[PDB]
Amino acid sequence: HHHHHFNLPPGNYKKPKLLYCSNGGHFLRILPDGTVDGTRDRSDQHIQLQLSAESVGEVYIKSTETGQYLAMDTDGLLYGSQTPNEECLFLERLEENHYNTYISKKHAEKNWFVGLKKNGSVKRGPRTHYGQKAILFLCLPV
Known part of the structure; x- marks a missing residue:
């Protein structure tokens, strides 16, 4: 049983990507200390991510620089996990036919x-919902 639709974007896990949020034009970043936030500095060494498919439609967002996994905790907070x-x-x-959205599976x-x-700060799970521009991402080339 599904809680969501199954419109999926075509395969794009071959090479590393940059998760660009159109909302404020920031790149998703996972700092070494496990901190997650946004930055418009495309030369930042921590915005380069690598997605991987576990099950059709399920992905892992990993930091190529630090090797950390993007994760969302029970309070809706994003963080960088070591495992x-x-x-x-x-x-x-x-979403909207051409954007990408990432939903916490848990x-x-x-x-x-x-x-x-828009200020590049991560939004909390409960504060997100369909129809926002903060949940709209685009996988750009590194």
Whole structure:
């Protein structure tokens, strides 16, 4: 049983990508200390990510620089995990036909997305929802 639709973006896990949030034009970054936030500096060595498919529609977002896994905790907070756990899986879905959205699999029913606010700060799960511009990402080439 699904809580969401199954419109998926075509395969793009071959090479490393940059998760660009159109909302404020920031790049998703996972700092060495496990901190996650946004930055417009495309030359930043920590915005380069590598997605991997676990199950059709399920992905892992990993830092090529530090090797950390993007993850969302029970309070809806994003962080960088040293090991893959059930909080690192995201349902990568197509939104508005051409954007990408990443839903916490663990909290899929509550509709918790990966989102960046216009000031580049990470948005909290419960504060995200369909229809926002913070949940709309685009995988750009490194």
